Amino acid sequence: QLRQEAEQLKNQIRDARKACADATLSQITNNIDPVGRIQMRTRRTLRGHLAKIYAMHWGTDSRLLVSASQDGKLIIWDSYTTNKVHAIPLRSSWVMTCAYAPSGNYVACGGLDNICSIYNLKTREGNVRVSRELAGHTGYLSCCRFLDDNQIVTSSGDTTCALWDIETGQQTTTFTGHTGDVMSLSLAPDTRLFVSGACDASAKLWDVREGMCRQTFTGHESDINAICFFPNGNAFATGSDDATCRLFDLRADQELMTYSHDNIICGITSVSFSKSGRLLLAGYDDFNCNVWDALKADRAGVLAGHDNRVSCLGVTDDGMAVATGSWDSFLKIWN
């Protein structure tokens, strides 16, 4: 009864999606000028981590960045002059995510201890101090992103995303629509909507205020690892372990274009966009990362400077450079 009705509604949704499609991004962007070869060089390298780097986040001013390592360190570097601005020890060395506040007054971290730690950077004495500890997730926190100095969004391995009020420390909103472990988080430029991909090969879009899911995408055939909103905000790219990454549109509510190659068998760890979204940065497990033409599914270039797999990468707000971290305990800035 209920299962039959659900199957019928799913079939109707699939039929509507198929009928709504009239063309593909490949034919529409067939006549555009190819990007060519985007050759970037490592203009800056940072070597202060003695363990694997699992997370990084660019600053709002595109000058200071943060990195999290398994040695128990959250290091804030000055990207321009390689100066180590700050180093925060962590209670638990098992950290897999980190966030930087848009105002720059706070930093975030989380990991296997299913606790989100928020540290105040701009203190009167100048010493970083723990400002908040959130413990409401059953599973490990996979990703966390700031909205302001008061609210934060986290996702954990217990198939649950949460919205935390830092001032109070409680869960204002909870999202439990995913049937798999949520692995990545990304927020819209207006910080009103956010998409999250889980281990059940599904990415769901959620409203920060309303608190319920509206669109769900199951294009991938493997567990999603990375997700990133388009700069416009009407699309987002997801990278998974099936050696391919896909682009979905909120208005189209279905697939647009996929980026894959025969020689790629390894999974994808991190995905990011540029200022215009013309070219996409995708970190793989084959010891190097790729730059794809987002509108033509063509490999624009390859950045290979890491001795281990690339775990995270990020593009500055002004698009001046990109930063890639890896398990080889080094983070490199390419431009």
Partner: protein, 205 residues
Amino acid sequence: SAEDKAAVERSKMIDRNLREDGEKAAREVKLLLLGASGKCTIVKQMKIGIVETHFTFKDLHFKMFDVTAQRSERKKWIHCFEGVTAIIFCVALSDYDLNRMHASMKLFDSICNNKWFTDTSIILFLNKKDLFEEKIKKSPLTICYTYEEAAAYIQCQFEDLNKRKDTKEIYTHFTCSTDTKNVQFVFDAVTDVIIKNNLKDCGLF
């Protein structure tokens, strides 16, 4: 070069602190507790998210990481344990008459054949020997598949699941009532692993 002088000096002292912290962290030996028996009550009952336990035996500081609270997918966070010195896998001999033993064997096979633990030593603890001593007298091992022959047969089947016999060594111990033998076995295993790591670092082999 007026404001950069202070910024550079901060970087140097932070780097010095990072070097000191790394040197301190490199002096610790690490154990990862696994099981299906997962809590490993035999090793957590000494006088001394995931649970971190610290204990000192023969001037060696052992850290133990217990991951029972992580009920999610194992493959998404096991790669964080590349640097653990050894993996302590606990399995109960009294669960043969409970599928549970088959689940323990499957978990051991999955952990031992993982790519992240190619060179990671595994210490196997066959717990609940005392109950299994007379539990076999009422139910035979044929349901699952003298105590001496059955224990040896279970141990050899558990050791047979290993495939990388050349890159890793498995230590099998029968848990006793006293706590003075498990500590000695763990110390011997970690001493052997430390010798292996030191010899590899020295470049002899």
